[PDB]
UniProtKB/Swiss-Prot annotation, chain A:
Gene that encodes it: SCL1
Gene3D superfamilies, A to Z: Glutamine Phosphoribosylpyrophosphate, subunit 1, domain 1
Phosphoserine modifications at: 228
Organism per entry: Saccharomyces cerevisiae (strain ATCC 204508 / S288c)
The protein's assembly and partners: The 26S proteasome consists of a 20S proteasome core and two 19S regulatory subunits. The 20S proteasome core is composed of 28 subunits that are arranged in four stacked rings, resulting in a barrel-shaped structure. The two end rings are each formed by seven alpha subunits, and the two central rings are each formed by seven beta subunits. The catalytic chamber with the active sites is on the inside of the barrel. Interacts with CIC1.
Listed name of the protein: Proteasome subunit alpha type-1
InterPro entries for this protein: Ntn_hydrolases_N (IPR029055), Proteasome_alpha (IPR050115), Proteasome_alpha-type (IPR023332), Proteasome_asu_N (IPR000426), Proteasome_sua/b (IPR001353), Proteasome_subunit_alpha6 (IPR034642)
Subcellular location, principal: cytoplasm
Curated annotation (Swiss-Prot), chain B:
Modification type N-acetylmethionine: residues: 1
Family as reported in the entry's similarity comment: Belongs to the peptidase T1B family.
Note, other: Present with 21800 molecules/cell in log phase SD medium.
The organism's place on the tree of life at top rank: Eukaryota
Protein's name in the database: Proteasome subunit beta type-4
Organism: Saccharomyces cerevisiae (strain ATCC 204508 / S288c)
Name of encoding gene: PRE1
UniProtKB/Swiss-Prot annotation, chain E:
Protein name per its UniProtKB record: Proteasome subunit alpha type-6
Keywords in alphabetical order: Cytoplasm, Isopeptide bond, Nucleus, Phosphoprotein, Proteasome, Ubl conjugation
InterPro entries for the chain: Ntn_hydrolases_N (IPR029055), Proteasome_alpha (IPR050115), Proteasome_alpha-type (IPR023332), Proteasome_asu_N (IPR000426), Proteasome_sua/b (IPR001353)
Family named by the database record: Belongs to the peptidase T1A family.
Gene this protein is translated from: PRE5
Pfam families, sorted: Proteasome (PF00227), Proteasome_A_N (PF10584)
From Swiss-Prot, chain H:
Record Gene3D superfamilies: Glutamine Phosphoribosylpyrophosphate, subunit 1, domain 1
Chain's gene name: PRE8
Lineage: Eukaryota, Fungi, Dikarya, Ascomycota, Saccharomycotina
Note: Present with 7060 molecules/cell in log phase SD medium.
Extent of the signal sequence: none
Record-given protein name: Proteasome subunit alpha type-2
UniProt source species: Saccharomyces cerevisiae (strain ATCC 204508 / S288c)
Amino acid sequence: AGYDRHITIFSPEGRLYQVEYAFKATNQTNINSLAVRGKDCTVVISQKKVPDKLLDPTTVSYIFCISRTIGMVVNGPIPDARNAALRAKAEAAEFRYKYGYDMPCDVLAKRMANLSQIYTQRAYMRPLGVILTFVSVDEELGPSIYKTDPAGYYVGYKATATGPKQQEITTNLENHFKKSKIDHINEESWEKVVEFAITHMIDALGTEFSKNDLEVGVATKDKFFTLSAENIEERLVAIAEQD
Amino acid sequence: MDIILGIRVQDSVILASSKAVTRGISVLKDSDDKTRQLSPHTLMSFAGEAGDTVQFAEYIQANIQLYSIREDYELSPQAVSSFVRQELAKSIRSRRPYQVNVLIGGYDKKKNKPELYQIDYLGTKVELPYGAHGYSGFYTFSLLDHHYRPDMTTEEGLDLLKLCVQELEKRMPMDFKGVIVKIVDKDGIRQVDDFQAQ
Amino acid sequence: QFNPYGDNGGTILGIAGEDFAVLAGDTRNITDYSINSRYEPKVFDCGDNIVMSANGFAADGDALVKRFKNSVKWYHFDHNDKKLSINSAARNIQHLLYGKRFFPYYVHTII
Amino acid sequence: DRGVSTFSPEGRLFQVEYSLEAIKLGSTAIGIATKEGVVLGVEKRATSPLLESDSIEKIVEIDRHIGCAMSGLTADARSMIEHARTAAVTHNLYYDEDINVESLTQSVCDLALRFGEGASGEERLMSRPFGVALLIAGHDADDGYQLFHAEPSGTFYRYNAKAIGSGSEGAQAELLNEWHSSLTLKEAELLVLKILKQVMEEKLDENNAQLSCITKQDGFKIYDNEKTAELIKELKEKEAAE
Amino acid sequence: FRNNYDGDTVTFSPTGRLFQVEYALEAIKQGSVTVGLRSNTHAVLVALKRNADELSSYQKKIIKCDEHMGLSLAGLAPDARVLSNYLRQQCNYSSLVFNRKLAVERAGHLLCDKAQKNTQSYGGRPYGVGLLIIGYDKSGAHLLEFQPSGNVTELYGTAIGARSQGAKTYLERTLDTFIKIDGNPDELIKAGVEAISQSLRDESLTVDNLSIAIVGKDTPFTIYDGEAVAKYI
Amino acid sequence: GYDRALSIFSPDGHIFQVEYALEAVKRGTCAVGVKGKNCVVLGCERRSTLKLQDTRITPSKVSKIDSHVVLSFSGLNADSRILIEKARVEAQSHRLTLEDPVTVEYLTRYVAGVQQRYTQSGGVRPFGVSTLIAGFDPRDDEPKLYQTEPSGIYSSWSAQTIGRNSKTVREFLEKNYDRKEPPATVEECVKLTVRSLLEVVQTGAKNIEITVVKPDSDIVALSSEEINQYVTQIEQEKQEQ
Amino acid sequence: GSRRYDSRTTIFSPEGRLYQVEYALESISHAGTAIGIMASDGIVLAAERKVTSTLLEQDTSTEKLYKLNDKIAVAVAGLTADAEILINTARIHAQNYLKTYNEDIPVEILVRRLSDIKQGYTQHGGLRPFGVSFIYAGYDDRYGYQLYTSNPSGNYTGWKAISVGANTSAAQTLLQMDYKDDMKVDDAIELALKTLSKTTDSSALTYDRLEFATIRKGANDGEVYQKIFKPQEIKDILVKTGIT
Amino acid sequence: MTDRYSFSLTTFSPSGKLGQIDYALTAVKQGVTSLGIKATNGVVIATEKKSSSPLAMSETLSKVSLLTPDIGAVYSGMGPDYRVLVDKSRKVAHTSYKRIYGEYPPTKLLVSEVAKIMQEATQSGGVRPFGVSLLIAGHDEFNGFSLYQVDPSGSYFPWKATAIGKGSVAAKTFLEKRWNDELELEDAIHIALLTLKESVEGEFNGDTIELAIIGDENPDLLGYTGIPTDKGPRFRKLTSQEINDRLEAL
Amino acid sequence: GTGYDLSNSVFSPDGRNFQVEYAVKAVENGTTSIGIKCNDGVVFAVEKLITSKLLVPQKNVKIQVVDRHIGCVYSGLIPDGRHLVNRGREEAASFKKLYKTPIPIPAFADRLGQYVQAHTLYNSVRPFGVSTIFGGVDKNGAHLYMLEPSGSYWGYKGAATGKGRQSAKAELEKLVDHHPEGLSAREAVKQAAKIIYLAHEDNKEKDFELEISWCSLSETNGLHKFVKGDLLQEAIDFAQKEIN
């Protein structure tokens, strides 16, 4: 009887508690992230928290370069995050080898969503306690954000956020898009899109950031890259000369 | 190649099978029974490669006997021959095929008609009024094409065989040491003991 | 093509006396018309008062002697240190050899 | 539930311990070791007079120089006997000699712990331990007449005398007093028959008990009912005499 | 508490304990006492063998692994058989492939690793035996202690089994003496026999009761039983 | 894949799954076997929970394993088919390799071995079946009767019964079967079988079937009337007293 | 590990019954009733559709009566999907037999084999049994018309008349009451319908809530015909027997 | 490692229920309403695109999926479960049919295959039933137009019209009142659009509604010309614009 | 309800895997061990409790080399630690065989990461009862790492685990502040010795033995080596002096 909460079998209410608690695990790191689309770029911002002084801050990341074109940011504990990363890299490599073109952002999302679906149905595999946000400038769909969860759900976004204060960031962004009446940030240079993303991150979280409180990934035509501390400092300086 | 002959008359099937077993330079036996009773009304004669011959026969025998006990029923000659055919057709494409040719003679108690099936090691089956394997048919098929009638009695079929054996004993190069003859009719399978000087 | 066999030449000799036995062999090892060694022992003490030689293809010879030595070691382990009688060694050797019936050790062995 | 190879807090294997309780419920078996041979006797214990007593086979031959008696779930002994016969015959094929009784026993005891739901070591494919104990008796040139007690724990002890089954504690105390290093085979036969009579729930006769021995000269033989009947006449008379 | 976490080896208790492993360790303390000790030229095993009845044999406690290595057991005998057999193989593989006698230290590492697997997987159980390994190799005399937890430890002397703490205290106290007992085998055994008796209670150690093993410089691993140990009583 | 140990020991030394397998036998319709001087007779009862059956094609309770050996059973019907099949296969295999049909004891040892195996293999439950196996060894004319149970224990019986109310019918048989003087005739052996069955069935024309096995593969199952004649003669032995 | 979550589908109760079988039978007892009647000149299969709606396409619908062979058909009581698994393997077994022997499979042989599959799920493998009971209606040249039944236990028996599914106790009483050995198919068709009409958990027996099959030696051939009745054909036969 | 769950997770309870199947059906009840209606010259399937955020792009998530050029599917219950079944359904349509008879399977047989996949998840070791009900609409030469419902048990039934999910009972009723055997395809689209309005709470337009038809052949949607016998898929998704054009005459 | 802590891969209602957290308790129950990164390498050190005079000193070595350039030390269940290094050694062999170059330290860290993470994915295995500090020199410098029973790892400037982790972690924090210009290999060896003497206070009941190893571009030529003889004594002395 009581074991319908230990494995991924249905509860009388038609629920899967293990999947629900997996969602709970995604907020364990207490970090928020958000993603936006430029005219021809895609930006991902994520909080960076280095409590321990003993750590080497350069190895403390939750963003991943999946391929030359695809970036992934993870909300959830680092071990499950790296597990998902390794797999997605192996999948992106394999796809290229077998089909002769680069795996699209949405397709890799779907693939990872399907893998998570399996853990949802088979009892020996636990769900991973992670939400995965995939970003790129797809050669067909343009700037792309695709996000998967421990239920095996996935969908494309105009913009998105994930983490403890997800709802605050979401509404903030929604409010900008009702006003602008368009589905992206009308900006030619990724630098200004990064700046927009940080700005709205600040407004919704009510917090100021130094160069070491964030982590930025940018995806362009044919590259995905991460910004350095100094790259971010340059961004933070520019937003200040405006307020 | 052993002489394996079969003829189907009015009310029975008769099988004649050579008694010699020869290995290289020596005739080792002159009393070999190249035959297995598959069921009370079905008989199988066989010729071919040295070991495969009895191994395959005894294996088919085992299978039919098992079926008889499970179902408390005797399979028709047609059903038995199809089973045998499929077994040989499996064999031909396996790692080491059974190199065995068979004649199946049975009396179908349901229809009250005798039946003779010729099947080679490839699993080629045909139903015939008379049949042979190997070189035998090269001498006998023309005798039988001539003297055979569908309404012949058992006694008539035996005289026709005697003729076939005489032709084989005149024109064939190997001494096959006479034949054992068996009759399959409504009453079962019996062995003609008097063929050495009939 | 690859030929897994060679011939290291080499001759051995066993004579049984009333209360003793000898196993002798030459010490020459060869390949075609060359000498590989003028002193490569080919008769070995195997323990339990048993001497053995497997003459022919040296690589096969060495494996067999090696494998029978290890058989004596385990006989002791598995049967409370019992002495392996000569007749029991003989029978054991049969099985070692016959285990390679379809890829034989190319040796003539005397114990 | 709980794994079939689980330790108790006292450091014993549950399933093995419970297996011993099954042994306790079995028919009695006794062995005596002498310098003239080793006797093995058992209690047939038919569950009904309609059962044909001589079809109860609780003393079996393993090889000419080795026999054994069983107690507990006797159905479990069949594949143990089978392994035992194979081990002995195989040894003779490989070595042109008789297997040592100790070696044969160790081989049987090797089977014992090969149970589990997939234990990380080798392949133990057997769902539970055996529910039968074994008295293995025989002779070899090195170590003479021998008696072993082989348990489903995989351990085996050598005994001068030993009793297993329902009447074992009683029979063992009796064996403790009666055994000495100078019994004769005839004394040993009478002694087994006597002690069986004490612990048996029927009146011992040639039908409901069976004797057997192993001697270097004649090997292992099961005594037919006539011979045992006479030994019982003989024991009844030697006891009535005092 | 304890009731809920001792079901299998694959389960941690809330304090970080593995109860099945602890229970396996219990099987050892229920086992008869054995002692190991070494100088710089020899290593010795002394074992007290235990009977079932006055009619029974005293069950063997010392197993040879190679000409230069062997061990004494306390706990489940069959598990000693499994592990010593694995050790026989590893010693053997070393001789065949490399023409190298296997280092006692390395034998220790292999035993540790084999035992460890059985403490991390479902369906399996820990070993229920402690082992004292002695050997002479290219770095001299050695004594190791094996625990089914997978902990292997090199020592000058030690004891495991029922009332083992007696002999272990004696050995700790006698340390500076026996470690020098070089070139003299009989005295090393004497120091072992005097160690094991510090754990006696039920009974003296008799002829068919004592078991002694010795390995060293020019002495292959050999077992002494009966009349052969009589001169040490 | 599935290898859960289902037959395991409990603290009092019992294997409960084997023990409960016996309870399924106690629930099966009664079966009895008696041996004569020159025959063996097998009798089985038919249940009457549902009656509208076709008797022609309903699998009957006594099975031929070879032409000289027969098997009957109490317990789960489905479980018994598997044992019947394996026994039939072994019979043919034995003839094929040994060039001799099975002895009754050999066949019994085989079936019992199979049952034992299902008491100590992961992923399987024991057979809910106990068997009576009877017939004559090749070329022997000494009758043979054996019994097997879920544990894999087997033994031979002068007479034996299994299934529901076997306690009752065993009592009858224990004080009606004289080992000194087996029913020397086929007829009086069939009579003793029907008598022992009537202590339990309570009025059985269509509820009793009988099979007679004599040496050299002589096996025949009786009809209702041939049985009904035995029912008539037995009831009149009481009434004339 | 896994053991914790193992229901243990193939064990005996302390009383020697098989839990999952008993509970499977319990499931079947809620399925639309199916009835088979055997005559001298053929067999009748009648089954009640469990639950209906105006929008159920009965034209294309099949849920109780399946063709296995040309000579053998079944009626299903229980889980439809579980039954389809078994149906498909039964169809293959028939073709395997025909290929091997060049003769159509005797009815019992096919029934025994399906019962054996069922039996396996009862003794090994740790899986739930199929929640299905079959009525088999067939013809062969050994025994003629035959009627069999099999349930989750993997036991099978032959019948003159029988019902599976819901209300079998009530239905068996009625069949036993009106059945006679010298029955003709046409009478048997009537009996099958009458019985269902008195046992339905629904108001009145309409055509759109039935499936009907006959196996007859139709006297115009001197070969055996399987007829799976169309909706209009059930509608007609319903009128003639006086149920309109 | 190794999947050691080789036992069933769906078993019979003493009442004869299969719990996990019931529970799967309960999950299906929670799902957004979807429906199918059969016309004389077509079938229509429809559902609501319940957007989980207005930042999400609803178009990127298709609830209505092509299975073959003449067969489409829609669902209610767990979206991720559906998505994998659609993958296996497309594949099985090939491996078990197109690769054997060189043509796409008829609706009843593709349905039969899906039903098999779901039944297996009801019995196989170490899994839970699928938490979806499918509605599969299609055409084939010999059967014409046909609508099927597949449930977590693997049972399927042909419908003239039906609905599953949240407002199934209510919508099933409304279909009974409006369905006849003479409906044209447009008549059915209209009736579908009416039925779906009662189910949605918020916005009701061509961006929220996903609706597809199985109708006439679409030579314009083939991609090539030259084989006269290929005249074009019968499956067609209606565009956002196509929906709204009909909602005005509502 | 409860029972969430009885099985390995199971999420508690607060998104935690309790079985892993219980493993962490086994780690905290262990001896203390540390890692210090320096200007061109890494230094490893561990406490070795003298259970008895009978332990042969300098013999029961606990620090392990992987390949030729990687050091690994751990706290907790020692057998579990060994198991992890065995896998680490295979993982390095496999990388070198295919790519020729010896495995980069980050790359090595993830191999261990994924393997440890794998043992938190199923209920058929138990998580690792160790925290492992490891690192070495590669193409682009020195790297230090600590890996938790959950599979969590990060790069560290200094690292500590076991009974005296707090003391050690405190001392480590001091050096990072006072030496922003980057400790040397020589100094780190001394400092390491001190840190272990100062974490021994939280275990001061049983004497102990010190064990140091290091991997330094200038001092060891990038190869992992143990600190022995003269340089070991000097470091004990440096520590023993500042305990007073």
